[PDB]
């Protein structure tokens, strides 16, 4: 029974560290995307005023 | 009155499937998107999904599919025929979404 | 790219199912998914950044606003700077994480082989027929300790001896 618990934990220890890195890394890229959003926004507004 | 387990299973699926049919007026879904949703219920993935979360399941499932592999959807978009590989891949992928 | 991140993530969700912990895992998963999905909706939301003055300054007669917004868009065409800058503080979290990772890994590796040894040890050493009870005293002084305290106490009742061995009462 004890062996069963242990075997799970071995594989976990490495692979979980991968996810740890991965999650924060994606979030960083997504931060940079906000600057893109601002490009989208200003242009949309400009077309609208001009249409009026 | 009393419902046999065969009948009950159909009812549970049926009621939930009917929920799935419904759409928000004046906002239609893409053709590509309709294929997995129908896949899910038919292949019995939505059998277990509790009734309350069906709306969540739909949006989340679609977001999941795109994020995990919009490659599958691109394939089904062009092929327009669900290959055995795609069918299995989709079964696997849908099951993956069910888990989450 | 992002699909790699998610493949390892969801593999880890169903792995994390099989180990203890999930208290703040789901909140982390929710957060990376949230902004990633926000960015996907962004990336589909994006229309060209530019006023199409090809036709729209070729139909406006209430002019002198097309040049204004042309200049406003092309002015702020440099939008505010990139948000890559967390990689020292992000790296630090990874250090802390690494410390913990290595601790778990080395511990369980040690324990696994210890348990293999323990199973083997039970099979080849164990008085599974019989052995001298003096040898049991030799392998554990706990025997003599409990006996001595009972002899000192004067109790000859052994608590629960009669509920997991007989007592052969003739009364």
From Swiss-Prot, chain B:
Highest taxon of the lineage: Eukaryota
Localisation: Mitochondrion inner membrane
Family the UniProt entry places it in: Belongs to the ATPase alpha/beta chains family.
SUBUNIT field: F-type ATPases have 2 components, CF(1) - the catalytic core - and CF(0) - the membrane proton channel. CF(1) has five subunits: alpha(3), beta(3), gamma(1), delta(1), epsilon(1). CF(0) has three main subunits: a, b and c.
Note: Present with 41500 molecules/cell in log phase SD medium.
Function comment: Mitochondrial membrane ATP synthase (F(1)F(0) ATP synthase or Complex V) produces ATP from ADP in the presence of a proton gradient across the membrane which is generated by electron transport complexes of the respiratory chain. F-type ATPases consist of two structural domains, F(1) - containing the extramembraneous catalytic core, and F(0) - containing the membrane proton channel, linked together by a central stalk and a peripheral stalk. During catalysis, ATP synthesis in the catalytic domain of F(1) is coupled via a rotary mechanism of the central stalk subunits to proton translocation.
Protein name: ATP synthase subunit alpha, mitochondrial
Gene from which this protein is expressed: ATP1
Positions spanned in the full protein: 445 to 544 of 545
Swiss-Prot record, chain C:
Assembly and interaction partners: F-type ATPases have 2 components, CF(1) - the catalytic core - and CF(0) - the membrane proton channel. In yeast, the dimeric form of ATP synthase consists of 17 polypeptides: alpha, beta, gamma, delta, epsilon, 4 (B), 5 (OSCP), 6 (A), 8, 9 (C), d, E (Tim11), f, g, h, i/j and k.
Entry annotated with the keyword Transmembrane helix: no
Primary location recorded for the protein, binned into one broad class: mitochondrion
Biological role stated in the UniProt entry: Mitochondrial membrane ATP synthase (F(1)F(0) ATP synthase or Complex V) produces ATP from ADP in the presence of a proton gradient across the membrane which is generated by electron transport complexes of the respiratory chain. F-type ATPases consist of two structural domains, F(1) - containing the extramembraneous catalytic core, and F(0) - containing the membrane proton channel, linked together by a central stalk and a peripheral stalk. During catalysis, ATP synthesis in the catalytic domain of F(1) is coupled via a rotary mechanism of the central stalk subunits to proton translocation.
GO cellular component labels: mitochondrial inner membrane; mitochondrion; proton-transporting ATP synthase complex
Subcellular location: Mitochondrion; Mitochondrion inner membrane
Protein name (database record): ATP synthase subunit d, mitochondrial
InterPro entries assigned to the protein according to its UniProt record, in alphabetical order: ATP_synth_F0_dsu_mt, ATP_synth_F0_dsu_sf_mt
Stored Gene3D superfamilies: 6.10.280.70
GO molecular function per UniProt: proton transmembrane transporter activity
A UniProt-annotated Pfam family: Mt_ATP-synt_D
């Amino acid at each position: 029974d004890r062996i069963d618990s242990v075997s799970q934990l071995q594989n976990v220890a490495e692979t979980t560290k991968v996810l740890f890195d991965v999650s924060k890394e994606t979030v960083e890229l997504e931060s940079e995307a906000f600057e893109l959003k601002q490009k989208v926004e200003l242009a949309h507004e400009a077309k609208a005023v001009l249409d009026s | 009155s009393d419902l046999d387990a065969s009948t009950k299973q159909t009812l549970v699926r049926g009621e939930r499937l009917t929920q799935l049919l419904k759409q928000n007026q004046y906002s239609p879904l893409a053709t590509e998107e309709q294929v997995p949703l129908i896949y899910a219920g038919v292949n019995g993935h939505l059998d277990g999904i509790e009734l309350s979360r069906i709306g969540e399941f739909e949006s989340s499932f679609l977001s999941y599919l795109k994020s995990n592999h919009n490659e599958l959807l691109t394939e089904i978009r062009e092929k327009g025929e669900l290959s055995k590989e795609l069918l299995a891949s989709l079964k696997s992928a849908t099951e993956s979404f069910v888990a989450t | 790219a992002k699909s790699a991140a998610n493949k390892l993530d969801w593999a880890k969700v169903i792995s994390s199912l099989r180990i203890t912990g999930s208290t703040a895992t789901q909140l982390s998963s929710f957060k990376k998914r949230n902004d990633e999905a926000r960015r996907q909706l962004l990336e589909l939301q994006s229309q060209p950044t530019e006023v199409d003055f090809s036709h729209y300054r070729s139909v406006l007669k209430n002019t002198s606003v097309i040049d204004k917004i042309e200049s406003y868009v092309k002015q702020y065409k440099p939008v505010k700077i990139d948000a890559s800058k967390q990689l020292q503080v992000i790296e630090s979290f990874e250090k802390h994480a690494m410390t913990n990772a290595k601790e778990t890994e080395s511990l369980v590796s040690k324990e696994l082989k210890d348990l293999q040894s323990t199973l083997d040890n039970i099979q080849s050493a164990r008085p599974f027929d019989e052995l001298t009870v003096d040898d049991l005293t030799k392998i554990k002084p706990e025997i003599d300790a409990k006996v001595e305290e009972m002899v000192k106490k004067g109790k000859w009742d052994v608590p629960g001896y009669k509920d997991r061995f007989g007592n052969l009462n003739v009364m």
